[PDB]
Enzyme design. Structure first.
Site, PDB file in Angstrom:
ATOM      1  N   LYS A  24      91.559  29.566 -41.201  1.00 55.94           N
ATOM      2  CA  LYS A  24      92.174  30.827 -40.739  1.00 55.94           C
ATOM      3  C   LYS A  24      91.628  31.300 -39.365  1.00 55.94           C
ATOM      4  O   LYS A  24      91.152  32.430 -39.233  1.00 55.94           O
ATOM      5  CB  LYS A  24      92.043  31.944 -41.802  1.00 55.94           C
ATOM      6  CG  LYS A  24      92.679  31.647 -43.150  1.00 55.94           C
ATOM      7  CD  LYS A  24      92.269  32.702 -44.156  1.00 55.94           C
ATOM      8  CE  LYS A  24      93.146  32.700 -45.374  1.00 55.94           C
ATOM      9  NZ  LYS A  24      93.249  34.060 -45.957  1.00 55.94           N
ATOM     10  N   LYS A 128     105.746  38.221 -44.109  1.00 51.82           N
ATOM     11  CA  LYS A 128     104.751  39.107 -43.497  1.00 51.82           C
ATOM     12  C   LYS A 128     103.660  38.328 -42.763  1.00 51.82           C
ATOM     13  O   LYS A 128     103.309  37.214 -43.164  1.00 51.82           O
ATOM     14  CB  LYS A 128     104.165  40.110 -44.514  1.00 51.82           C
ATOM     15  CG  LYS A 128     103.451  39.469 -45.695  1.00 51.82           C
ATOM     16  CD  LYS A 128     103.034  40.510 -46.737  1.00 51.82           C
ATOM     17  CE  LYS A 128     102.149  39.929 -47.810  1.00 51.82           C
ATOM     18  NZ  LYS A 128     101.047  39.109 -47.231  1.00 51.82           N
ATOM     19  N   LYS A 157     100.141  38.688 -51.981  1.00 50.98           N
ATOM     20  CA  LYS A 157      99.796  37.511 -51.203  1.00 50.98           C
ATOM     21  C   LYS A 157      98.755  37.905 -50.150  1.00 50.98           C
ATOM     22  O   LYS A 157      98.765  39.047 -49.677  1.00 50.98           O
ATOM     23  CB  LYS A 157     101.040  36.906 -50.514  1.00 50.98           C
ATOM     24  CG  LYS A 157     102.254  36.662 -51.399  1.00 50.98           C
ATOM     25  CD  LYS A 157     102.040  35.701 -52.577  1.00 50.98           C
ATOM     26  CE  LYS A 157     103.249  35.886 -53.464  1.00 50.98           C
ATOM     27  NZ  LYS A 157     103.115  35.247 -54.791  1.00 50.98           N
ATOM     28  N   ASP A 158      97.896  36.936 -49.754  1.00 50.84           N
ATOM     29  CA  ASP A 158      96.836  37.086 -48.742  1.00 50.84           C
ATOM     30  C   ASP A 158      97.269  37.853 -47.532  1.00 50.84           C
ATOM     31  O   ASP A 158      98.369  37.648 -47.020  1.00 50.84           O
ATOM     32  CB  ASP A 158      96.330  35.722 -48.270  1.00 50.84           C
ATOM     33  CG  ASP A 158      95.159  35.163 -49.043  1.00 50.84           C
ATOM     34  OD1 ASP A 158      94.985  35.545 -50.240  1.00 50.84           O
ATOM     35  OD2 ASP A 158      94.433  34.322 -48.474  1.00 50.84           O
ATOM     36  N   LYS A 159      96.390  38.726 -47.067  1.00 55.60           N
ATOM     37  CA  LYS A 159      96.603  39.507 -45.863  1.00 55.60           C
ATOM     38  C   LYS A 159      96.492  38.562 -44.644  1.00 55.60           C
ATOM     39  O   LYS A 159      97.497  38.370 -43.963  1.00 55.60           O
ATOM     40  CB  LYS A 159      95.624  40.692 -45.811  1.00 55.60           C
ATOM     41  CG  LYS A 159      95.697  41.531 -44.539  1.00 55.60           C
ATOM     42  CD  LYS A 159      94.935  42.839 -44.702  1.00 55.60           C
ATOM     43  CE  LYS A 159      94.565  43.487 -43.376  1.00 55.60           C
ATOM     44  NZ  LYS A 159      95.726  44.138 -42.720  1.00 55.60           N
TER      45      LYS A 159
END
Length: 509
Positions: A24, A128, A157-159
């Site tokens: 990430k 998103k 869901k993951d930010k």
């Protein structure tokens, strides 16, 4: 500060030599596509509104009839064609006047002043970027002037990622949602349909991940061996670091289970190592021990510290049970669940260390939705992928081997009783559940990509494809190397635990 070893994350499946890689680095290096109840993999790929005045003009005129004028352009001008628009507008015109205007050659029809056949729920895909699911729901709720509970989803869901999932909303038209795309920056909506039911939490089959690990230090031999093992056997199904929190959540959970309420309060509100506004709120609390004074330092209304401070203002420091009880139930259970998660990670690591990656007699297995034992004689009928271990509670059974003794010891070390995991307060009574120890990811694919610039994404997102962005092409050699992976996971599984198995490196930063 909090390491993987601190939360019982210590073992690996593969025997391959570990290597380094960045996770990430850009939110576009981590992409999530939800796998629906029916197996469909949610993608934002259609912006059409389900079926002379198009969907936009109808929305523009509906917005006019409620709260100066709506001018509709006459494309193929004719006396019959104009009167048709006058009459078609008159259908969706409760209190609207209609007039034909010739504006220097260009003609206009100027407007002045839910079917039971159609399912109650508009379903749609929410794309998103660097946002939480609830955050997207709040933005849509304020724009549509509705309450967030008319929206439903299968999971959050993951930010820090690009994520795509299905959402359902009660009695809002597809046109009303699609119109919002022009003013939404980090989210987009599409793939509209009308259906009978809302979505249900945990109904999803899982999620599909596309992961880019930047600057890999691994050789081609190391990568192939890491990936082949992940594809064939998989990874240990640990609860990732996210389950454990600033405030170490399992410790609050432990204190709740021990009825050590002063400690519960101190763990949430007292100053500690490593969010600016929370630091100031905690400093004001330590200095004044006054809920009203510490609440002044909180810019956010819905946060655990604020809710507890409001509870303490109501009941006081001699009734922390009731003060803490003010926090929404879901946020309270999260602490005691992360304590169960802490014990589970430690037990699984001990189970791997003592018996290996093979099913052993005494192990629990899951035969559909029923939990049962592996005996000496039927040991070879099962695979490690059938093995389950319990989250501790009053309703579960434990494996018939030595790990049962380890569960008892760990719980006794926290003054808890394995034989009676009932709490005096109903909300904190844990029934327990079963969780698979090893997960084999599905639809696994990978490639090593040579690159020079880290900013450049290695693949298109759903929005890139919609905008017709050129798909990335890469050279056979470059300065840096990236490991690009694709895999599907079931629900309640952590992609960081799959990546951890590939890299064999601990999750810190």
């Amino acid at each position: 500060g909090l390491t993987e070893a601190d939360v019982g994350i210590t073992k690996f499946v593969s025997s391959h030599q570990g290597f380094s890689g960045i996770l990430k680095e850009r939110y576009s290096d981590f992409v999530v596509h939800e796998i629906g109840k029916d197996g469909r993999i949610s993608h934002l790929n259609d912006l059409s509104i389900p079926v002379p005045s198009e969907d936009i003009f109808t929305v523009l005129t509906a917005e006019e009839k409620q709260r100066t004028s709506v001018a509709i352009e006459v494309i193929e001008d004719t006396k019959e064609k104009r009167t048709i628009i006058h009459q078609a507008i008159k259908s969706l015109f409760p209190g609207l006047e209609t007039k034909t205007e010739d504006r220097e050659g260009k003609k206009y029809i100027v407007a002045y002043h839910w079917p039971k056949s159609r399912g109650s729920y508009c379903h749609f895909v929410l794309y998103k970027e660097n946002k939480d699911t609830m955050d997207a729901i709040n933005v849509l709720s304020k724009y549509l002037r509705v309450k967030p509970n008319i929206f439903s989803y299968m999971g959050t869901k993951d930010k820090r990622a690009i994520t795509v999932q299905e959402i359902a909303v009660l009695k809002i038209t597809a046109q009303r949602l699609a119109h919002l795309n022009k003013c939404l920056m980090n989210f987009k909506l599409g793939n509209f349909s009308y259906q009978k039911n809302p979505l249900k939490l945990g109904e999803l089959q899982g999620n599909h991940f596309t992961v880019v690990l930047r600057n890999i230090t691994g050789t081609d031999d190391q990568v192939q061996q890491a990936m082949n093992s992940l594809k064939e056997i998989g990874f240990i199904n640990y609860y990732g670091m996210q389950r454990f929190g600033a405030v170490p959540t399992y410790q609050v959970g432990r204190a709740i289970l021990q009825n050590s309420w002063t400690e519960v309060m101190d763990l949430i509100l007292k100053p500690r190592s490593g969010k600016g506004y929370l630091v100031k709120c905690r400093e004001e609390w330590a200095k004044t021990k006054d809920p009203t004074a510490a609440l002044r330092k909180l810019p956010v209304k819905r946060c655990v510290e604020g809710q507890l401070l409001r509870g303490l203002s109501k009941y006081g420091m001699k009734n922390i049970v009731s003060a803490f009880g003010i926090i929404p139930r879901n946020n309270r259970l999260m602490y005691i669940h992360s304590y169960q998660s802490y014990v589970w990670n430690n037990m699984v690591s001990k189970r791997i260390e003592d018996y290996g990656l093979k099913p052993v007699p005494g192990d629990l297995v899951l035969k559909g939705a029923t939990a049962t034992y592996i005996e000496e004689d039927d040991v070879n009928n099962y695979s490690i992928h059938d093995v389950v271990m319990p989250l501790p509670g009053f309703d579960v059974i434990y494996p018939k081997h030595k790990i049962q003794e380890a569960y008892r010891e760990m719980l006794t070390a926290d003054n808890l009783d394995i034989d009676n995991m009932r709490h005096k307060i109903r909300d904190y009574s844990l029934s327990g559940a079963y969780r698979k120890i090893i997960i084999r990811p599905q639809n696994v694919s990978w490639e090593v990509v040579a690159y020079d610039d880290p900013k450049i994404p290695l693949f298109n997102t759903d929005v890139d494809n919609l905008e017709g962005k050129t798909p990335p092409v890469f050279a056979s050699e470059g300065k840096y190397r990236a490991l690009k992976m694709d895999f599907s996971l079931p629900p309640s599984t952590y992609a960081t635990m799959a990546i951890r198995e590939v890299l064999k490196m601990d999750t810190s930063i």
